[PDB]
Amino acid sequence: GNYNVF
Amino acid sequence: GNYNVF
Amino acid sequence: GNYNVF
Amino acid sequence: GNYNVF
Amino acid sequence: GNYNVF
Amino acid sequence: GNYNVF
Amino acid sequence: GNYNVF
Amino acid sequence: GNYNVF
Amino acid sequence: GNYNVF
Amino acid sequence: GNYNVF
């Protein structure tokens, strides 16, 4: 999966 | 899946 | 799935 | 599914 | 499903 | 409180 | 409170 | 509190 | 608190 | 606190 986490 | 989390 | 979470 | 959650 | 939740 | 539950 | 329940 | 639960 | 739970 | 949980 793709995770862009801030 | 795709997760863009802020 | 797609999750855009703020 | 698609989740846009604010 | 599609969930746009505010 | 605010509860949006699916 | 506010409850939106599905 | 705020609860958005899927 | 804020809870966005999937 | 803030909890975004998948």
Residue numbers in the entry:
A (entry chain A), B (entry chain A), C (entry chain A), D (entry chain A), E (entry chain A), F (entry chain A), ...: 286 to 291
Sentences from the paper on this structure:
The protein hnRNPA2 functions in RNA stabilization, splicing, trafficking, and translation. In its role in protecting mRNAs, it is a component of cytoplasmic stress granules, one of the so-called membraneless organelles (MLOs). Its 341 amino-acid-residue sequence contains an RNA-binding domain (RBD) with two RNA recognition motifs (RRMs) and a 161-residue C-terminal low-complexity domain (LCD). The LCD is rich in Gly, Tyr, Phe, Asn, and Asp residues, and poor in hydrophobes, with Val, Ala, Leu, and Ile entirely absent.
A missense point mutation that converts a conserved aspartic acid to a valine (D290V) in hnRNPA2-LCD was identified in 2013 as being associated with ALS and MSP2. To investigate the structural differences between the wildtype and the mutant, we crystallized the hexamer segment 286GNYNVF291 containing the disease-causing mutation and determined its structure by X-ray crystallography. As expected, the crystal structure of the mutant segment forms a steric zipper motif and the sidechains of the two β-sheets mate tightly with each other in a dry interface. The area buried (Ab) and shape complementarity (Sc) for the mutant segment are 104 Å2 per chain and 0.86, respectively. The mutant segment structure forms in-register, parallel β-sheets. The backbones of the wildtype structure and the mutant segment fit well with each other, whereas the sidechain of Asp290 in the wildtype structure clashes with Asn289 of the mating sheet of mutant steric zipper, disrupting the steric zipper formation. When the conserved Asp290 residue is mutated to a Val, the mutation enables a more stable steric zipper interaction that was previously prevented by the Asp290 sidechain. The mutant segment, as we expected, precipitated after shaking (left), and TEM images showed that the precipitates were composed of micro-crystals (left). The results suggest that the mutant segment with the pathogenic mutation forms a more stable structure than the WT segment, and converts a gel-promoting segment into an aggregation-promoting segment. Unsurprisingly, the mutant segment is an outlier in terms of having greater energetic stability than any hexameric segment in either hnRNPA2 or FUS.
